[PDB]
Amino acid sequence: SDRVKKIESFTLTLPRETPGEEPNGRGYLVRKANRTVYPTFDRSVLVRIETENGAVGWGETYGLVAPRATMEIIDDLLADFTIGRDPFDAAAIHDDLYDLMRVRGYTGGFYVDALAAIDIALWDLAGKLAGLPVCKLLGGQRRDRIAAYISGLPEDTRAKRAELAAAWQAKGFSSFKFASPVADDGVAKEMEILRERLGPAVRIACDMHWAHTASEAVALIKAMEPHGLWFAEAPVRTEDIDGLARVAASVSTAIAVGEEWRTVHDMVPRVARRALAIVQPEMGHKGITQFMRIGAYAHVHHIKVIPHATIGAGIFLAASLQASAALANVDCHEFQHSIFEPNRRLLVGDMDCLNGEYVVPTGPGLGVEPSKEAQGLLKKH
């Protein structure tokens, strides 16, 4: 039976772009507002895995910052220990790979990014080898469409953002999220405009972008609640578990977190403190094995799953849809309009998002692969 023969990693850089916030000599800028670094152009790391019989699997992970660090991990360590393995042992292979370095504490960050790209490609292969979509190897397909929500409203002013939203509503979308930092007029007002414009039927959530104390977050949420708030995301710092638990206990709005996590181990202490109502796994950080472990833990603990979505060619997005098709508790899924649209030329397969819903790809494996054009754009490590 077929075994992994070779593994290659590449970056894929895209022409889509991100006062005193100019990129540095390496193409990185920092937003003074949040002290977070951003690259100038979209970019992700892809991994190509081929078996002895010539089957090919594709995986993908973040590559926004120092992507050659991730590729070095794949190339220097993981590749040589994955060659020879059976892709049907994907989750066990994942655990083996994770154990290589766990006792030295490389149990997140770049290390799990690397693991994810490999994990996704092995699962892609398993599906192809068996002639099944990945969700049929994950316990079954529960749905073939997944509701999508508009990830944000990147406009200059409140008025404009609200119109942008109404445009999307016209296309069949009835769930939306805005980021609190962009709310120049304040969250209460943003919420007011959106509710007014869009009506009482739509769901409206707010991503608070982490930088608040528990008390600051509570005040902001309370100010939004009168206008019908779907959920509040990332109200406090990642490390501030006590803060997160206080916030969830203090407001009646569902609290959502998780996009910056890496493994199910990250979820456990937040559930222990009943600090979240919704988990938001980002497939590109986690890989299928962990993303499923988080979704299953959410099932046991009665937490809703609303996966994150981000900059990427569509490979880990495809994995996110497959895994999401197989999870009991997946309600809805983030949708990045300005990323999904332009990236269409990069993919072959029938993945789509239209009329407020994702279409889960149907072919074996992920159901999608990089187009000939995409494969030409790839730059090998």
Footprint of a second copy on 7-66 (CB under 8 A): 24-26, 28, 30, 34-37, 62, 64-66
Gap between the Cα atoms of 209 and 237, Å rounded: 9
15-33: b (≥16 Cβ within 10 Å) or e: eeeeeeeeeeeeeebeeee
Q: Applying CB under 5 A, which part among 35-43, 102-110, 127-135, 232-240 lies near Cl ion?
A: 102-110
Q: Applying CB under 8 A, which part among 83-91, 167-175, 314-322, 370-378 lies near a second copy?
A: 83-91
Residue 53 CB: number of other CB atoms within 10 A? 10
Gap between the Cα atoms of 361 and 353, Å rounded: 11
Contacts of 183 (CB under 8 A, 6+ apart): 158, 189, 190
158 lies in the binding site for a second copy (CB under 8 A): no
10, 58, 98, 110: which one binds Cl ion (CB under 5 A): 110
Q: Does the CA dihedral 369-319-125-8 come out positive or negative?
A: positive
CB hemisphere CA count around 280 (13 angstroms)? 23
Q: Which is nearer to a second copy, 79 or 347 (CB)?
A: 79
27 and 43 in contact (C-beta within 8 Å)?
A: no
Q: Which is nearer to Cl ion, 110 or 178 (CB)?
A: 110
Q: Applying CB under 5 A, which part among 105-113, 156-164, 182-190, 357-365 lies near Cl ion?
A: 105-113
- Partner whose footprint covers residue 207, from Mg ion, Cl ion, a second copy, none (CB < 5 to 8 Å by kind): Mg ion
Beta bridge partners of 330: 305
Find the binding residues for Mg ion in span 161-190 (CB under 5 A): none
**Within the chain, how many helices (H) and strands (E) appear?**
12, 18
179 lies in the binding site for a second copy (CB under 8 A): no
264 and 250 in contact (C-beta within 8 Å)?
A: no
Sheet strands (E) in the chain: 4-17, 28-31, 36-39, 41-51, 56-62, 145-150, 175-179, 203-207, 231-233, 254-257, 278-279, 304-305, 333-335, 347-349, 352-354, 357-359, 368-370, 379-380
In the complex, the smallest distance separating the C-beta of residue 113 from Cl ion, rounded to whole angstroms, is 8
Find the binding residues for Mg ion in span 194-213 (CB under 5 A): 207
Q: Which is nearer to Mg ion, 58 or 149 (CB)?
A: 149
Site string for a second copy, 325-344 (x = CB under 8 A): -x-x----------------
Q: Which is nearer to a second copy, 203 or 371 (CB)?
A: 203
- The answer to whether 259 is annotated as binding is yes
185 lies in the binding site for a second copy (CB under 8 A): no
Helix (H/G/I), strand (E/B), else coil: 150: strand
72 lies in the binding site for Cl ion (CB under 5 A): no
SS3 of the chain: helix, strand, coil, percent, to 5: 45, 25, 35
Q: Which is nearer to Cl ion, 115 or 206 (CB)?
A: 115
Find the binding residues for a second copy in span 203-242 (CB under 8 A): 209-210, 213-216, 218-219, 222, 236-242
109 lies in the binding site for Cl ion (CB under 5 A): yes
6, 18, 21, 81: which one binds a second copy (CB under 8 A): 81
The residue count of the chain comes to 381
In the complex, the smallest distance separating the C-beta of residue 68 from Cl ion, rounded to whole angstroms, is 13
106 lies in the binding site for a second copy (CB under 8 A): yes
Footprint of Mg ion on this chain (CB under 5 A)? 207, 259
As annotated, the binding site includes: 207, 233, 259
